[PDB]
Amino acid sequence: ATAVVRCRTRLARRVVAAVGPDGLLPAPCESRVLESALALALLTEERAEADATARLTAYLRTTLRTAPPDPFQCAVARAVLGGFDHFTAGRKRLMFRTVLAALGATGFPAVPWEAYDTRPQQSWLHMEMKALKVLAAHGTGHPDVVRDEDWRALLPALEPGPAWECNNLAQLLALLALRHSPRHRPALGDVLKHVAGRLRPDGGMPYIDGMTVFTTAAAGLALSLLPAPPACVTPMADALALRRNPDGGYGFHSGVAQSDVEDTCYVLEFLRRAAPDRHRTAVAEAEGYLLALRNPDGGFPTFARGTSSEIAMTAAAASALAHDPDRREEVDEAVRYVVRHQRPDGTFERSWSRNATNAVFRAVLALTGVAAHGEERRSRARAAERALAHLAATQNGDGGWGHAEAEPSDPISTAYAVIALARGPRARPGGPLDRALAYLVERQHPDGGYRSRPDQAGPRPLLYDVPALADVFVLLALAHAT
Numbered sequence: 140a141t142a143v144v145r146c147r148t149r150l151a152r153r154v155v156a157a158v159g160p161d162g163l164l165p166a167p168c169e170s171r172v173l174e175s176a177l178a179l180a181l182l183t184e185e186r187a188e189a190d191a192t193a194r195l196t197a198y199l200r201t202t203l204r205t206a207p208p209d210p211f212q213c214a215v216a217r218a219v220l221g222g223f224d225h226f227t228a229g230r231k232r233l234m235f236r237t238v239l240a241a242l243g244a245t246g247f248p249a250v251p252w253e254a255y256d257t258r259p260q261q262s263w264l265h266m267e268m269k270a271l272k273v274l275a276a277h278g279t280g281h282p283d284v285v286r287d288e289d290w291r292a293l294l295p296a297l298e299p300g301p302a303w304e305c306n307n308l309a310q311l312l313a314l315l316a317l318r319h320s321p322r323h324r325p326a327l328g329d330v331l332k333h334v335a336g337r338l339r340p341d342g343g344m345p346y347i348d349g350m351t352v353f354t355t356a357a358a359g360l361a362l363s364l365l366p367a368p369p370a371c372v373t374p375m376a377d378a379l380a381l382r383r384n385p386d387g388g389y390g391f392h393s394g395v396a397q398s399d400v401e402d403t404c405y406v407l408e409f410l411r412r413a414a415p416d417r418h419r420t421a422v423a424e425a426e427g428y429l430l431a432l433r434n435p436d437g438g439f440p441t442f443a444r445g446t447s448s449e450i451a452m453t454a455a456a457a458s459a460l461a462h463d464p465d466r467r468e469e470v471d472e473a474v475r476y477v478v479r480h481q482r483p484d485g486t487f488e489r490s491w492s493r494n495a496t497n498a499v500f501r502a503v504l505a506l507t508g509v510a511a512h513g514e515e516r517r518s519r520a521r522a523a524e525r526a527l528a529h530l531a532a533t534q535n536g537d538g539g540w541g542h543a544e545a546e547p548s549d550p551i552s553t554a555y556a557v558i559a560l561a562r563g564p565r566a567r568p569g570g571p572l573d574r575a576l577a578y579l580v581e582r583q584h585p586d587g588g589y590r591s592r593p594d595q596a597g598p599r600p601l602l603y604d605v606p607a608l609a610d611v612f613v614l615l616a617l618a619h620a621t
């Protein structure tokens with residue numbers, strides 16, 4: 140067949156081979172400068188784990204020369220070795236300033252202590268903010284400001300074993316605060332040993348344990364779009380469904396009790412295609428989870444109602460709930476939210492991904508997948524057309540797309556664009572979709588896989604790197620488009 144189908148086939152073989160007999164696609168996260176630096180500071184201040192501290196130190200220096208990250212993380216690493224268009228901005232300015240001050244690189248924000256108090260949402264955001272407030276209280280010489288409720292938010296960080304909610308950043312920040320408390324120091328020795336035991340072969344500390352639930356769901360979805368899905372989709376559906384949380388949603392990795400809309404939508408889309416009856420109850424519990432989260436403006440948040448609806452989250456929930464005709468009223472209200480928020484140049488937003496193409500792909504699938512007729516058909520078709528025109532206008536000479544219009548191409552950003560474009564008109568020779576496919580064919584590695592700069596962000600906008608996602612998302616693009 141075509142070079143595209145051959146590329147698709149080699150890739151599917153690789154993705155199938157990487158699924159384990161437990162039905163999971165392992166998705167470890169790479170070392171990150173930020174957490175390595177924090178781990179370095181914590182162990183150093185406690186005069187602990189000299190072996191780990193030297194490895195951490197070599198990793199940080201090696202990475203600064205050869206693959207240095209964003210400037211915030213470099214300045215964090217330098218402190219230890221010695222624009223944002225989003226509703227979260229501000230809280231992030233406070234968070235990132237306090238981190239650098241805690242490490243002695245800048246002054247503590249001269250803000251009222253209530254600045255650090257946040258509504259209940261993401262389980263670990265509360266812990267992170269409380270930890271930073273404690274570090275600022277003690278850093279500025281006002282330890283008596285710390286309330287007993289501030290300390291109590293940090294207690295999960297003193298549990299043995301892997302970090303609570305798989306978040307090394309949250310635990311490290313909490314531990315850096317807790318070591319200032321005599322009441323809590325008896326539990327510290329034991330966790331410092333498990334922390335030191337987390338180093339990766341290259342000597343660094345990853346942001347999170349991994350993203351196996353998200354990655355297995357995306358891979359299962361891609362495999363289920365193939366002409367003949369492999370057999371392993373059933374054990375993958377089983378592995379996801381048995382990990383569902385009591386609220387019916389899904390976290391990003393094994394042992395994440397915090398559900399989120401993005402993970403739940405990928406599990407939901409996947410189970411609807413590969414196991415709608417075998418996993419009928421899991422499917423219905425996931426729709427219930429999404430429906431209970433919906434905001435009154437028609438949109439959907441990431442984690443918790445009452446927090447800002449997001450475009451991509453709202454687009455993802457519209458596609459995921461479209462299958463059942465009984466949610467037409469909620470699905471349509473979601474798609475209208477997407478249309479209302481399209482920007483003047485056809486784009487949408489950056490959030491959990493750092494490229495523009497991610498939100499476009501979500502938006503376009505919601506806009507074209509929910510069947511529609513009449514004036515609302517016209518209105519959605521126009522919105523979708525402007526999103527695909529935006530893609531055509533920012534396509535790079537090699538046929539791919541980067542994180543930003545003037546950025547070098549990468550396979551993941553390109554994969555998102557292809558999914559969107561496969562919903563447009565038929566690939567004409569030398570058309571944008573045709574050229575993006577040619578870009579993906581040419582970037583296939585000899586081992587059948589893809590190496591791509593990462594797109595996942597957390598805390599936004601800091602990138603972290605789960606390499607298994609590159610194969611998964613390119614496969615999802617190739618499956619959608621063929």
Ligand SMILES: CC(C)=CCC/C(C)=C\CC/C(C)=C/COP(=O)(O)OP(=O)(O)O
Pocket residue numbers: 227261263264306347353391399401402441491595596597598599600
């Ligand atoms: C792709 C993904 C599944 C989308 C949902 C995001 C999340 C549930 C998974 C990404 C990994 C996670 C621990 C980042 C959240 O960081 P954070 O709490 O600090 O985020 P924030 O401060 O920017 O709000």
Ligand SMILES: [Mg+2]
Pocket residue numbers: 264267598
């Ligand atoms: Mg945060």
Ligand SMILES: [Mg+2]
Pocket residue numbers: 263267306308309597598
């Ligand atoms: Mg975090």
